[PDB]
Subunit: 145 residues, 3 copies
C-alpha cells in the first residue's frame, strides 16, 4: 500500500510525522499481514487555508488519508483498518478524530509495482518476498522500524 | 467527497481559492443533494513548470480536479457534475476550459471515512447525520459557507 | 492519462523532470496509441523525509508514479506499461529500480474530462480528435514533443 497523507505545513513535527507513519504502517501490518516494508506513507504538506469544508476555509488541523490498496480484501477488514487508522492517527498526531478523513481505493495487484516489482495477491506476500533476489530482499529488509 | 485540486503556486489568490472551492462544493451539493459540509476541497499547489502535457512544460494555468466519491451514482449524473465543475471552476478561476481536467474516482462508502465517521450511501444522507453525537453535528454545522 | 509523480524536493533537476515526463509520455503513447498531448505528467515535490517505508524515514530517492487511466485496457497491456515506466523512469532520472513505485488506477471515460472535454473509449482517439473544434485541435497539438 501507499498512504497519501495530506496535512497542513508544519502541523506534524518530524517525530509526529514518524509516529503517524508507524501508526498507519502497524495497523496495516497488524490487519493485512503484509510485511512492513511494503507499506509506504507519503506525507503531502500544504500551507494552512488550502483545505475547504462546505466552502469554509480551514486552519491546519485537517488530515486526509488516501490509502491505495490491492484488491482482494473484504469490506469488514477494510473498515476495521480504516477505523484503526482514524483512532491511532488521532493519538499519534494529537488531533481530534473529527479532523480525520480516510478513503481507501483499490486496484488489481498486477497493475501495482513496488520496489520495481509487481505485487502478489493479498495474503501470499511471503512466497513473493522469497523469490526476490538477494539484493532486493536486503533493500526492503532495511525498511522495518 | 474530497476534491483534490492541483494548481500551480500563486495561480489562485485566497479569494480565487474560495470561489473555486465554492463552485465545486455548490455543484456537488446542488447535483447530489448531499449536505453542503460533507464536501472537502483541497488545494495541492506546486511550482509552475511541474505540469507537462505530451512532454511540454506548462505555465501555471493547468488545473486538475481529482474527485473521490462514494459509489452509487449514475454515469449521467457524474457527467453533469463534471461538466458543471469545468464551467463553474472556469468562471471562478478566470481560466479557459481547455485548461481544466476532471477525473472522478469511486470507492464503496464502507471504506471511506469523514469527520472520523463511516459514510452512508448517497441514499441515506439525512438519517446518517441524525445518528451522530451532538458535538459532531455541531462541528460539521460550522462547515457550511454563509 | 494523468500521471501524478511524487518526488522529493530538488531530486529532479528541471532537466530530469523533463526527461521523466518525456519517458512516461512516450511509454504511454507507444503502448496505448493515444496521442501525445493527451498525457499529463504532474510532478508533486515534497521535502525529503516525507516518505516512509516500513515506518522508516526515507531520503530523497523514492519515486511514486500514480497513473489515472480510462477503463478499457487489458491487464497484460497495463503491466507492460507499468514495467516500461519503471525501466524508463530509472534511466531518465538515474535511479535504481528498487526506488520506483507505480500504481495504475482506472475510471470510466464518461467521468473523465481532459482539455475541457470528456474522453472517448481507449482506441477511439482518432475520431474524437476528428470532432474537436479547430481551436481545440490547434491547442492540443501545441503540447507534443
Amino acid at each position: 500500500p501507499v498512504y497519501m497523507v495530506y496535512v497542513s505545513q508544519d502541523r506534524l513535527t518530524p517525530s509526529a510525522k514518524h509516529a503517524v507513519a508507524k501508526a498507519i504502517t502497524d495497523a496495516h501490518r497488524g490487519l493485512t499481514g503484509a510485511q512492513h516494508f511494503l507499506a509506504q506513507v507519503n506525507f503531502q504538506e500544504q500551507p494552512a487555508g488550502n483545505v475547504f469544508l462546505g466552502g469554509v476555509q480551514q486552519g491546519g488541523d485537517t488530515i486526509f488519508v488516501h490509502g491505495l490498496h490491492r484488491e482482494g480484501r473484504s469490506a469488514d477488514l477494510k473498515g476495521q483498518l480504516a477505523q484503526r487508522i482514524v483512532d491511532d492517527v488521532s493519538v499519534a498526531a494529537e488531533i481530534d478524530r473529527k479532523h480525520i478523513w480516510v478513503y481507501f481505493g483499490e486496484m488489481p495487484a498486477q497493475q501495482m509495482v513496488e520496489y520495481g516489482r509487481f505485487l502478489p495477491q493479498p495474503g501470499h506476500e511471503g512466497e513473493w518476498f522469497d523469490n526476490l533476489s538477494s539484493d532486493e530482499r536486503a533493500f526492503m529488509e532495511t525498511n522495518v522500524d
